[PDB]
Amino acid sequence: IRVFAIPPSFASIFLTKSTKLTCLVTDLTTYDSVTISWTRQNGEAVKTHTNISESHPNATFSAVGEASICEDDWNSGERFTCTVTHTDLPSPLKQTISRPLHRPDVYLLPPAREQLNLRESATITCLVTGFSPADVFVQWMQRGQPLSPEKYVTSAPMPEPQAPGRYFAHSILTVSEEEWNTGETYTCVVAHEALPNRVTERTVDKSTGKPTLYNVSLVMSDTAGTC
């Protein structure tokens, strides 16, 4: 007897714009739910539930229920209840999930010089800090084309030790040292609800970084009153 309801995610409303309440019922002997339903406080119905899974290898069945909702059907402060039924409990089981901010800061950190001296793979990192709530998505784009998620990883946001309202996390992309020698776009695209456009890219290349040799060539004359 395992019943749960999960809300949508920001990583799906930005990637595909497909907000939807999901209701996962498993471990029930005969049937998880002969009839999935989703209800709201105002008594609004939902759409169909499909893509039912086969029985588990552990002699039990899996079932899923879908509530395809509007984009604003989760930011208006309302509850959702997943009506599920079984054969041993005469009462239709119920479960409820609802919704409860500060702008983040993105920082690029250049790969350490020591690993550049080893010439296998530099790890570029983009730190996202001070975001509230912990609702940040991170992806990496090269030359305008995104990279596969198998190349970069993102940390689960943790609360700040000093500012519990704030949250912090990061993402890292491994690249061959030589490629970073030649250089690429290396864009860390970030997506948090506390963003104007949902958009705050920052990027890095071999061109930028710690400058090891300046040369200033400031000039002086006496009539350039018109730069």
Binding site: N181, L218, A224, T226
Partner: protein
């Protein structure tokens, strides 16, 4: 190259480049190429000459990567108004500090 702070008010243009060096490893160089073009003989309040001579020249590489400034642009104009007696009646007349830049 990478210098999108060509603001011709404070004259700055600090571009970036990477020494495609001698073909060793990525022992590369990162540069910051400033060229500030001081007017030095200009006036403090850029649109009014009655202000004293501008002696100090402050240069922050933060505001010049976009305000009072030092020189005149060819695409912008700065003007002034002047009086005169000619007897009793005094009439404001319009002059332009930047000729061949905003001449009617």
């Amino acid at each position: 190259r990478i210098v999108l702070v060509d603001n011709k008010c404070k004259c700055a243009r600090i571009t970036s480049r990477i020494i495609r060096s001698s073909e060793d490893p990525n022992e590369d160089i990162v540069e910051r190429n400033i060229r500030i073009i001081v007017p030095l003989n200009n006036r403090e309040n850029i649109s009014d000459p009655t202000s004293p001579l501008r002696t100090r020249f402050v240069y922050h590489l933060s505001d010049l990567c976009k305000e009072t400034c030092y020189t005149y642009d060819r695409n912008k104009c700065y003007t002034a108004v002047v009086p005169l007696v000619y007897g009793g009646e005094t009439k404001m007349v319009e002059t332009a500090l930047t000729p061949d830049a905003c001449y009617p």
